[PDB]
């Protein structure tokens, strides 16, 4: 059933994941010296290429591949259109390893045929709370705690094969080469997410959407008009009213994040994230990189009253190409990123996210039910979509956890 995934150090069935009680590696210990020094073999008509993610033109080439060939819905209505600026942000965080970004090109014209990207993340991925308790009850605390220390691992994203090369077993080759490059740097685990079900997620969450421009969302068939709106003389007018938001933020002291806020934002974020079983650890440089405002890419606001930062939220932009509509060709989506609330309820913090995103011309706000995202779904009028995000580890046995015990946002 899985000619590639059956050969890999991942849990092979749901049952297996159901049985795991302690975090830890799946494969035997290996050294960098054990890993092939030469690139994985590839057909003579292709070549491995390491793009330079800082160089505008190489980012452009990757941008074009993804624009035309990255994830689309099953009805081929929307395809992600991550921007060049977003891709430089996502793929070159502090201390990134250039060699972890892997492409295939056709040797003749050098047309870009495939890509996958790894970036460093420092992740807490030891045994979850519910399982450390079972371990205490059984006299097995030492085993349960062995891997408690945050680990420096690889986060994988942006796997893409050109549509003309689909179903040719190229993705397994790209994954093997990426694994080799990561292993040659003495890293042995990865974390990744996908919409599709593969062997085997340690957590799964539904996507939620909050309409900001319902007229446009209905026009492009992102949204339908719920049946009960047909009871109205003007179904669309009622839908627009339903989703109306204030034109200015409500929280006293909300303002954009600035560099001097990095230590305070790191503090309150780290205190909050600590409470979840799986979550990242960020340095000041990583807080700066992932949270300071960048035009068109990431938007971050703090609540400062009386000279202290007590709360913050962030969102990022991923537009999608709208493929077959007469009136629009772009969907402008805002995605809930990290946040932390200490002075106000989370719903009150995130309402100002929606207000700001709507003011800035976003059409929808998206999120997965990770973190405490479920705590403001109903009041703030999010609805569940039909999609899910599944969370996976490579070479890491991990108990099944609920998505509200995951604190890692994946771009
Ligand atoms: C220690 C370091 C480790 C580093 C590596 C960690 C692992 C990272 C793993 C990657 C995490 C990526 C996270 C993201 O970016 S998820 C986003 C993935 N990208 C897209 O969906 C974009 C549009 N689609 C495509 O570009 C292609 O259809 C892709 C490239 C997805 C597959 O190309 P293609 O359609 O031409 O197929 P093939 O003949 O070459 O290969 C078929 C094999 O591929 C398995 N497959 C299909 N979809 C996925 C998928 N999303 N993750 C993992 N495996 C996938 C499939 O089950 C089959 O294996 P098996 O069922 O036969 O066994
Ligand atoms: C069946 C009803 N649908 C189908 C479309 C669904 N949406 C918005 C959606 N939208 C997608 N894209 C690319 C736009 C995401 C946004 N915003 C993708 S990419 C893979 C699945 C998928 N699904 C949700 C509503
Ligand atoms: C591989 C990592 N990511 C993480 C984010 C994924 N995104 C942005 C995403 N993915 C969606 N789905 C349904 C998962 C698609 C995939 N893979 C949806 S439905 C509405 C917005 C939306 N957005 C694209 C794939
Ligand atoms: Mg292929």
Coordinates of C-alpha atoms and ligand atoms in Angstrom, one line a residue:
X1 CA 0.0 0.0 0.0
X2 CA 2.9 2.4 0.7
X3 CA 5.9 1.4 -1.4
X4 CA 7.9 4.4 0.0
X5 CA 6.4 5.1 3.4
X6 CA 6.7 1.4 4.4
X7 CA 10.5 1.7 4.1
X8 CA 10.8 4.8 6.4
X9 CA 11.2 5.2 10.2
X10 CA 7.6 6.3 10.9
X11 CA 4.8 4.6 12.7
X12 CA 3.1 2.4 10.1
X13 CA -0.5 2.2 11.5
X14 CA -3.0 4.1 13.7
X15 CA -2.9 1.1 16.1
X16 CA 0.9 1.4 16.5
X17 CA 0.6 5.2 17.4
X18 CA -2.2 4.2 19.8
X19 CA 0.2 1.9 21.6
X20 CA 3.2 4.4 22.0
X21 CA 3.7 5.5 25.5
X22 CA 7.2 7.3 25.4
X23 CA 8.7 9.7 23.1
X24 CA 12.0 8.6 21.4
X25 CA 13.8 7.6 18.1
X26 CA 12.6 4.8 15.8
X27 CA 15.8 4.0 13.9
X28 CA 19.1 2.6 15.2
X29 CA 21.7 5.3 16.3
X30 CA 23.8 6.3 13.3
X31 CA 26.7 8.8 12.9
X32 CA 27.3 11.4 10.1
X33 CA 30.1 9.0 9.0
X34 CA 27.6 6.3 8.3
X35 CA 25.6 8.6 5.9
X36 CA 26.5 8.5 2.2
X37 CA 28.7 11.5 1.3
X38 CA 27.5 11.5 -2.4
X39 CA 24.0 12.7 -3.4
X40 CA 21.3 10.1 -3.8
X41 CA 21.2 8.7 -7.3
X42 CA 19.0 10.5 -9.8
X43 CA 18.2 9.9 -13.5
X44 CA 20.8 11.1 -15.9
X45 CA 18.4 13.7 -17.4
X46 CA 18.0 15.5 -14.0
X47 CA 20.3 17.2 -11.5
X48 CA 20.2 18.2 -7.9
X49 CA 20.3 22.0 -7.4
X50 CA 20.6 24.0 -4.1
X51 CA 18.9 27.4 -4.7
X52 CA 20.2 30.4 -2.9
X53 CA 17.2 31.6 -0.9
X54 CA 18.6 35.0 -0.3
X55 CA 19.1 35.6 -4.0
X56 CA 16.0 37.3 -5.6
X57 CA 16.2 35.4 -8.8
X58 CA 16.5 31.9 -7.2
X59 CA 13.6 32.8 -4.9
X60 CA 11.7 33.8 -8.0
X61 CA 12.3 30.4 -9.7
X62 CA 11.0 28.6 -6.6
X63 CA 8.1 31.1 -6.4
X64 CA 7.1 30.2 -10.0
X65 CA 7.2 26.4 -9.4
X66 CA 5.0 26.8 -6.4
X67 CA 2.6 29.3 -8.0
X68 CA 1.9 26.9 -10.8
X69 CA 2.2 23.5 -9.1
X70 CA 1.7 23.7 -5.3
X71 CA -1.3 22.6 -3.3
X72 CA -4.7 23.1 -4.9
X73 CA -8.2 22.0 -3.8
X74 CA -9.8 18.9 -5.4
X75 CA -12.0 21.0 -7.7
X76 CA -9.0 23.0 -8.9
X77 CA -10.5 26.4 -7.9
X78 CA -7.7 27.7 -5.6
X79 CA -4.0 27.2 -5.6
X80 CA -1.6 28.7 -3.0
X81 CA 0.4 31.7 -4.2
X82 CA 3.0 32.2 -1.5
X83 CA 4.8 35.4 -2.3
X84 CA 8.5 35.7 -3.0
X85 CA 8.9 37.8 0.2
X86 CA 7.1 35.2 2.2
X87 CA 9.3 32.4 0.8
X88 CA 12.5 34.3 1.7
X89 CA 11.0 34.8 5.3
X90 CA 10.0 31.2 5.7
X91 CA 13.0 29.5 4.3
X92 CA 15.8 31.7 5.7
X93 CA 15.2 32.0 9.5
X94 CA 18.2 32.5 11.9
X95 CA 20.9 29.8 11.4
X96 CA 19.2 28.2 8.4
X97 CA 21.2 25.6 6.5
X98 CA 21.4 26.4 2.8
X99 CA 21.9 22.7 1.9
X100 CA 18.5 21.8 3.4
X101 CA 16.8 23.5 0.6
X102 CA 16.7 20.8 -2.2
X103 CA 15.6 21.2 -5.9
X104 CA 15.6 19.1 -9.0
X105 CA 16.2 20.6 -12.4
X106 CA 16.1 19.2 -15.9
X107 CA 19.7 19.3 -17.0
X108 CA 19.2 20.6 -20.5
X109 CA 17.2 23.9 -20.0
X110 CA 17.6 23.8 -16.2
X111 CA 13.8 24.0 -15.9
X112 CA 12.9 23.6 -12.2
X113 CA 11.0 20.3 -11.8
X114 CA 10.8 19.8 -8.0
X115 CA 11.5 21.3 -4.5
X116 CA 11.5 20.5 -0.8
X117 CA 12.7 22.7 2.0
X118 CA 14.0 22.1 5.5
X119 CA 14.6 24.7 8.2
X120 CA 15.9 24.4 11.8
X121 CA 13.4 24.4 14.6
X122 CA 14.0 23.9 18.4
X123 CA 11.1 21.7 19.4
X124 CA 9.9 20.3 22.7
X125 CA 8.9 16.8 21.7
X126 CA 9.2 14.7 24.9
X127 CA 6.6 12.5 26.3
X128 CA 3.3 14.4 26.8
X129 CA 1.7 15.2 30.2
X130 CA -1.0 12.5 30.0
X131 CA 1.7 9.8 29.4
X132 CA 4.2 11.1 32.0
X133 CA 1.4 10.5 34.5
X134 CA 0.8 7.0 33.3
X135 CA 4.6 6.5 33.7
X136 CA 4.6 7.8 37.3
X137 CA 1.8 5.3 38.1
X138 CA 3.9 2.5 36.7
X139 CA 7.3 3.3 38.1
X140 CA 8.5 4.3 34.5
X141 CA 9.3 8.1 35.0
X142 CA 12.9 7.8 33.9
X143 CA 12.0 6.2 30.5
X144 CA 9.2 8.8 30.0
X145 CA 11.6 11.8 30.7
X146 CA 14.6 10.7 28.6
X147 CA 13.8 13.0 25.7
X148 CA 12.4 16.0 27.6
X149 CA 15.1 18.4 26.5
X150 CA 14.1 20.7 23.5
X151 CA 15.7 19.1 20.4
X152 CA 17.3 20.9 17.4
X153 CA 15.5 19.3 14.5
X154 CA 14.3 19.9 10.9
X155 CA 10.9 21.3 9.9
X156 CA 10.0 20.3 6.3
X157 CA 7.7 22.4 4.0
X158 CA 7.0 23.2 0.4
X159 CA 7.4 19.7 -1.1
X160 CA 6.4 20.2 -4.8
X161 CA 6.7 18.2 -8.0
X162 CA 5.8 19.9 -11.3
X163 CA 2.5 18.7 -12.7
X164 CA 4.1 17.2 -15.8
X165 CA 6.3 14.9 -13.6
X166 CA 3.6 13.6 -11.2
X167 CA 3.2 9.9 -10.3
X168 CA 6.8 9.1 -11.4
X169 CA 8.2 8.4 -7.9
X170 CA 10.1 11.7 -7.8
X171 CA 8.8 12.8 -4.4
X172 CA 10.4 9.7 -2.6
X173 CA 13.8 10.6 -4.2
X174 CA 13.6 14.2 -3.1
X175 CA 12.6 13.1 0.5
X176 CA 15.6 10.7 0.6
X177 CA 18.0 13.3 -0.6
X178 CA 16.6 15.8 1.9
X179 CA 17.0 13.2 4.7
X180 CA 20.5 12.5 3.6
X181 CA 21.4 16.3 3.8
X182 CA 19.8 16.7 7.2
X183 CA 21.5 13.5 8.5
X184 CA 24.9 14.8 7.2
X185 CA 24.4 17.7 9.7
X186 CA 23.8 15.3 12.6
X187 CA 20.0 15.8 12.7
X188 CA 17.9 12.7 12.8
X189 CA 14.3 13.9 13.3
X190 CA 11.9 16.1 11.4
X191 CA 8.5 17.5 11.9
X192 CA 6.1 18.1 8.9
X193 CA 2.4 18.6 8.2
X194 CA 0.1 17.8 5.3
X195 CA -3.6 17.9 4.4
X196 CA -3.4 14.3 3.2
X197 CA -3.4 11.2 5.4
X198 CA 0.0 9.4 5.4
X199 CA 1.5 6.9 7.8
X200 CA 1.0 8.1 10.6
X201 CA 0.0 11.5 12.2
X202 CA 0.6 12.1 15.9
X203 CA -2.1 14.8 15.9
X204 CA -4.8 16.1 13.5
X205 CA -6.9 19.3 13.6
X206 CA -9.6 20.8 11.5
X207 CA -9.2 24.1 9.7
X208 CA -11.5 27.0 10.6
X209 CA -12.3 30.1 8.6
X210 CA -13.7 33.4 9.6
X211 CA -15.3 35.4 6.7
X212 CA -14.1 39.0 6.4
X213 CA -15.4 39.7 2.8
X214 CA -18.4 37.3 2.5
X215 CA -19.6 38.8 -0.8
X216 CA -16.3 37.9 -2.5
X217 CA -16.0 34.5 -0.7
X218 CA -19.4 33.5 -2.1
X219 CA -18.6 34.9 -5.6
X220 CA -15.5 32.7 -5.8
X221 CA -17.2 29.6 -4.2
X222 CA -14.9 29.6 -1.2
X223 CA -18.2 29.9 0.7
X224 CA -21.8 29.1 0.0
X225 CA -24.8 31.0 1.5
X226 CA -26.2 28.8 4.4
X227 CA -29.7 27.6 3.5
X228 CA -31.4 29.4 6.3
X229 CA -30.4 32.7 4.7
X230 CA -32.9 32.0 2.0
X231 CA -35.7 32.8 4.5
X232 CA -34.6 36.4 4.0
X233 CA -35.6 38.9 1.3
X234 CA -31.9 39.7 0.8
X235 CA -29.8 36.7 1.7
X236 CA -26.5 38.4 0.8
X237 CA -27.3 41.6 2.7
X238 CA -28.0 39.5 5.8
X239 CA -24.7 37.5 5.3
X240 CA -22.7 40.7 5.0
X241 CA -24.3 42.1 8.2
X242 CA -23.6 38.8 10.0
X243 CA -19.8 39.1 9.4
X244 CA -19.5 42.9 9.8
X245 CA -16.6 44.1 12.0
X246 CA -15.5 47.3 13.7
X247 CA -13.4 49.6 11.5
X248 CA -10.7 50.3 14.2
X249 CA -9.3 48.0 17.0
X250 CA -11.1 48.0 20.3
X251 CA -8.1 47.4 22.7
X252 CA -6.6 50.3 24.4
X253 CA -3.0 50.4 23.7
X254 CA -2.8 48.1 20.6
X255 CA 0.0 49.0 18.3
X256 CA 2.5 47.3 15.9
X257 CA 5.3 45.4 17.5
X258 CA 8.8 47.0 17.4
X259 CA 12.3 45.7 18.0
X260 CA 12.4 46.8 21.6
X261 CA 9.3 44.5 22.3
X262 CA 11.3 41.3 21.5
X263 CA 12.3 40.4 25.1
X264 CA 8.8 40.9 26.5
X265 CA 7.1 39.1 23.6
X266 CA 9.5 36.2 23.9
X267 CA 8.8 36.0 27.6
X268 CA 5.0 35.9 27.4
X269 CA 5.1 33.6 24.4
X270 CA 7.5 31.2 25.9
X271 CA 5.4 31.1 29.1
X272 CA 2.3 30.3 27.2
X273 CA 3.8 27.8 24.7
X274 CA 5.4 25.9 27.6
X275 CA 2.0 24.6 28.6
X276 CA 1.5 22.5 25.4
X277 CA 3.0 19.0 24.9
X278 CA 4.6 19.8 21.4
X279 CA 5.8 23.3 20.9
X280 CA 8.8 25.4 19.6
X281 CA 11.4 27.2 21.7
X282 CA 12.5 30.6 20.2
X283 CA 15.6 32.6 20.8
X284 CA 15.4 36.4 20.6
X285 CA 16.7 36.3 17.1
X286 CA 13.9 33.8 16.1
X287 CA 11.3 36.0 17.8
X288 CA 12.6 38.9 15.8
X289 CA 12.6 37.0 12.6
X290 CA 9.1 35.3 12.9
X291 CA 7.2 38.1 14.6
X292 CA 8.6 41.6 13.7
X293 CA 6.2 43.1 11.1
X294 CA 7.3 42.6 7.4
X295 CA 5.2 44.2 4.7
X296 CA 2.9 41.9 2.8
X297 CA 4.1 38.9 5.0
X298 CA 3.6 39.0 8.7
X299 CA 1.6 41.4 10.9
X300 CA 2.2 41.6 14.7
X301 CA 0.5 43.8 17.3
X302 CA 1.1 44.2 21.0
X303 CA -1.2 45.5 23.7
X304 CA 0.8 48.0 25.7
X305 CA -0.8 49.9 28.4
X306 CA 1.1 52.0 30.9
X307 CA 4.4 51.1 29.3
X308 CA 4.2 47.3 29.6
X309 CA 3.5 44.8 26.8
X310 CA 0.9 42.4 28.3
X311 CA -0.5 40.7 25.1
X312 CA 0.2 40.3 21.5
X313 CA -1.0 38.6 18.3
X314 CA 0.4 37.9 14.9
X315 CA -1.0 36.8 11.5
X316 CA 0.6 36.1 8.2
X317 CA -0.6 36.4 4.6
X318 CA -0.9 33.6 2.1
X319 CA -2.8 34.6 -1.1
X320 CA -4.2 31.9 -3.4
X321 CA -4.8 32.1 -7.2
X322 CA -8.5 31.9 -7.9
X323 CA -8.5 29.7 -11.0
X324 CA -11.8 29.9 -12.9
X325 CA -13.9 32.9 -11.7
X326 CA -14.8 35.9 -13.9
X327 CA -14.5 38.6 -11.3
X328 CA -11.5 37.8 -9.1
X329 CA -8.2 36.1 -9.6
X330 CA -6.8 36.3 -6.0
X331 CA -8.0 35.2 -2.5
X332 CA -6.2 37.2 0.2
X333 CA -6.0 35.0 3.3
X334 CA -4.8 36.0 6.8
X335 CA -3.7 33.1 9.0
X336 CA -3.6 33.2 12.8
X337 CA 0.1 32.8 13.9
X338 CA 1.4 33.0 17.5
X339 CA -0.2 35.0 20.2
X340 CA -0.3 35.3 24.0
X341 CA -2.9 36.9 26.3
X342 CA -2.2 37.9 29.9
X343 CA -4.5 41.0 30.5
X344 CA -7.6 40.3 28.4
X345 CA -9.6 37.2 27.3
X346 CA -8.3 35.6 24.2
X347 CA -11.5 36.3 22.3
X348 CA -11.0 40.1 22.9
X349 CA -7.4 39.9 21.6
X350 CA -8.3 38.0 18.5
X351 CA -11.2 40.2 17.7
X352 CA -8.6 42.9 17.1
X353 CA -6.8 40.5 14.8
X354 CA -9.9 40.2 12.7
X355 CA -10.5 43.9 12.7
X356 CA -7.0 44.7 11.6
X357 CA -7.0 41.9 9.0
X358 CA -10.3 43.2 7.5
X359 CA -9.0 46.8 7.6
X360 CA -6.0 45.7 5.6
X361 CA -8.1 44.1 2.9
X362 CA -7.9 40.4 3.8
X363 CA -10.9 38.3 2.6
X364 CA -10.8 35.5 5.2
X365 CA -8.9 34.5 8.4
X366 CA -7.8 30.9 8.6
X367 CA -6.4 28.7 11.4
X368 CA -6.1 25.2 12.7
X369 CA -7.6 24.2 16.0
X370 CA -4.1 24.1 17.7
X371 CA -3.1 26.2 20.7
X372 CA -6.3 27.6 22.3
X373 CA -7.8 28.4 19.0
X374 CA -11.0 26.6 19.9
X375 CA -11.6 29.0 22.8
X376 CA -12.8 31.8 20.4
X377 CA -14.3 29.9 17.5
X378 CA -18.0 30.5 18.3
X379 CA -18.0 34.1 19.6
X380 CA -15.8 35.2 16.7
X381 CA -17.9 33.4 14.1
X382 CA -15.3 31.0 12.8
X383 CA -16.7 27.9 11.1
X384 CA -15.0 24.5 10.5
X385 CA -14.0 23.9 6.9
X386 CA -13.6 20.4 5.4
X387 CA -9.9 20.4 5.6
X388 CA -7.6 19.2 8.2
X389 CA -3.9 19.6 9.0
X390 CA -2.2 16.4 10.1
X391 CA 1.1 16.6 12.2
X392 CA 3.8 14.1 11.6
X393 CA 7.3 13.3 12.9
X394 CA 10.1 11.5 10.9
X395 CA 12.1 9.0 13.1
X396 CA 10.2 9.9 16.3
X397 CA 7.8 7.6 18.1
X398 CA 5.2 9.8 19.8
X399 CA 1.8 9.1 21.5
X400 CA -1.4 10.4 19.8
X401 CA -2.3 13.8 21.2
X402 CA -5.2 16.2 20.7
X403 CA -4.5 19.2 18.5
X404 CA -5.1 21.5 21.5
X405 CA -1.8 20.1 22.9
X406 CA 0.1 21.3 19.8
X407 CA 1.7 24.7 19.8
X408 CA 3.7 24.5 16.5
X409 CA 2.3 26.8 13.8
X410 CA 3.3 25.6 10.3
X411 CA 3.5 28.1 7.5
Ligands
LIG1 C1 15.7 13.6 9.5 C2 15.3 14.5 8.3 C3 14.0 13.9 7.6 C4 13.6 14.9 6.5 C5 12.4 14.3 5.7 C6 11.2 14.1 6.5 C7 10.0 13.6 5.7 C8 9.2 14.7 4.9 C9 8.1 14.1 4.1 C10 7.5 15.2 3.2 C11 6.6 16.2 3.9 C12 6.0 17.2 2.9 C13 5.1 18.3 3.6 C14 4.4 19.0 2.6 O1 5.0 19.9 1.9 S1 2.7 18.8 2.3 C15 2.4 19.6 0.8 C16 2.8 18.7 -0.4 N1 2.7 19.4 -1.7 C17 1.6 19.3 -2.5 O2 0.6 18.8 -2.1 C18 1.8 20.1 -3.8 C19 1.0 19.4 -5.0 N2 1.4 18.0 -5.2 C20 2.6 17.6 -5.5 O3 3.5 18.5 -5.7 C21 2.9 16.2 -5.6 O4 1.6 15.5 -5.8 C22 3.7 15.6 -4.4 C23 5.1 16.2 -4.4 C24 3.0 15.9 -3.1 C25 3.8 14.1 -4.5 O5 4.3 13.8 -5.8 P1 3.6 12.8 -6.8 O6 2.2 13.0 -6.7 O7 4.2 13.0 -8.1 O8 3.9 11.3 -6.3 P2 5.3 10.4 -6.5 O9 5.0 9.4 -7.5 O10 6.4 11.3 -6.8 O11 5.4 9.8 -5.1 C26 4.4 9.1 -4.5 C27 4.7 8.9 -3.0 O12 4.6 10.2 -2.3 C28 3.8 10.1 -1.2 N3 3.2 11.4 -0.9 C29 2.2 12.0 -1.7 N4 2.0 13.2 -1.1 C30 2.8 13.3 0.0 C31 3.1 14.3 0.9 N5 2.3 15.5 0.9 N6 4.0 14.2 1.8 C32 4.7 13.0 1.8 N7 4.5 12.0 1.0 C33 3.6 12.2 0.0 C34 2.7 9.0 -1.6 O13 2.1 8.6 -0.5 C35 3.6 8.0 -2.3 O14 4.3 7.2 -1.3 P3 3.7 5.7 -1.0 O15 2.3 5.9 -0.6 O16 3.9 5.0 -2.3 O17 4.6 5.2 0.1
LIG2 C1 -15.9 21.4 -0.5 C2 -15.9 22.9 0.0 N1 -14.6 23.6 0.0 C3 -13.5 23.1 -0.9 C4 -12.5 24.3 -0.9 C5 -11.9 24.3 0.5 N2 -10.8 25.3 0.5 C6 -11.0 26.7 0.8 C7 -9.5 24.9 0.2 N3 -8.7 25.9 -0.2 C8 -7.5 25.7 -0.7 N4 -6.7 26.8 -1.0 C9 -5.5 26.6 -1.9 C10 -7.0 28.1 -0.6 C11 -6.8 28.1 0.9 C12 -7.2 29.4 1.4 N5 -7.5 30.4 1.9 C13 -7.0 24.3 -0.7 S1 -5.6 23.6 -1.1 C14 -6.1 21.9 -0.7 C15 -7.4 22.0 -0.2 C16 -7.9 23.3 -0.2 N6 -9.1 23.6 0.2 C17 -13.0 24.7 1.6 C18 -14.4 24.7 0.9
LIG3 C1 2.9 21.7 4.2 C2 2.6 22.8 5.2 N1 1.4 23.5 4.8 C3 0.9 24.2 6.0 C4 -0.3 25.2 5.6 C5 -1.2 24.6 4.5 N2 -2.3 25.8 4.3 C6 -1.8 27.1 4.2 C7 -3.6 25.6 4.2 N3 -4.0 24.3 4.0 C8 -5.3 24.0 4.0 N4 -5.5 22.6 3.8 C9 -6.9 22.2 3.7 C10 -4.3 21.7 4.0 C11 -3.7 21.6 2.6 C12 -2.4 21.0 2.4 N5 -1.3 20.3 2.3 C13 -6.2 25.0 4.1 S1 -8.0 25.1 4.0 C14 -8.1 26.7 4.2 C15 -6.8 27.3 4.3 C16 -5.8 26.3 4.2 N6 -4.5 26.6 4.3 C17 -0.4 24.4 3.2 C18 0.6 23.2 3.6
LIG4 MG1 6.7 12.0 -9.4

